[PDB]
């Protein structure tokens, strides 16, 4: 069996399901980034002006 070869397999299920879990988490956290950034855009261009004035 050449180094690093095909030998076994188990129930990878529980472990991939939780991988998919943890990639959904992320996949929403980036979608928080969307809003929790534009909110700052609306409040950067509000402030940078209101302060000048």
């Amino acid at each position: 069996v050449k180094k690093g070869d095909l030998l076994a397999e188990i129930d990878s299920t529980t472990q991939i399901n939780t991988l998919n879990t943890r990639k959904a988490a992320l996949a929403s956290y980036q979608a928080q980034l969307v809003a929790r950034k534009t909110a700052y855009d609306v409040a950067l261009s509000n402030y940078q002006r209101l302060s000048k004035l």
Binding site: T13, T14, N17, T18, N20, T21, A24, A25, A27, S28, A31, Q32, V34, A35, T38, A39, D41, V42, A43, S45, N46
Partner: protein, 105 residues
């Protein structure tokens, strides 16, 4: 907002408070997922409802009792022993001085 007045301060509400609506809906998607996922895994920890016999061969042991508590967290309780009796295979012990000679086929 192209109609001259409607101060930007009330357009910006709408912009960022659109993205917050949209994104607060995405969050509930990823939650729908995680729930569908963890529910299928919550029926896949319910695979164990016959303890299906891996092969047919015939039955060769049975160490269990119908009515008996088991404790599989620590070491794995073997329950039935099922191996294949349509062939068999004999294992010739074959001593350390004959083996230079004993060849395959």
């Amino acid at each position: 907002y192209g109609q001259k007045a409607t101060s930007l301060d009330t357009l910006n509400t709408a912009k960022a408070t659109l993205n917050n609506a949209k994104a607060e809906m995405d969050v509930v998607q990823e939650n729908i997922k995680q729930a569908e996922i963890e529910v299928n895994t919550a029926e896949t920890n319910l695979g164990y409802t016959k303890i299906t016999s891996p092969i047919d061969g015939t039955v060769i042991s049975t160490p269990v009792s119908e009515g008996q508590t088991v404790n599989s967290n620590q070491t794995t309780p073997t329950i039935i022993k099922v191996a294949d009796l349509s062939k068999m295979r004999i294992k010739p012990e074959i001593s350390e001085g004959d083996i230079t000679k004993v060849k395959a086929g």
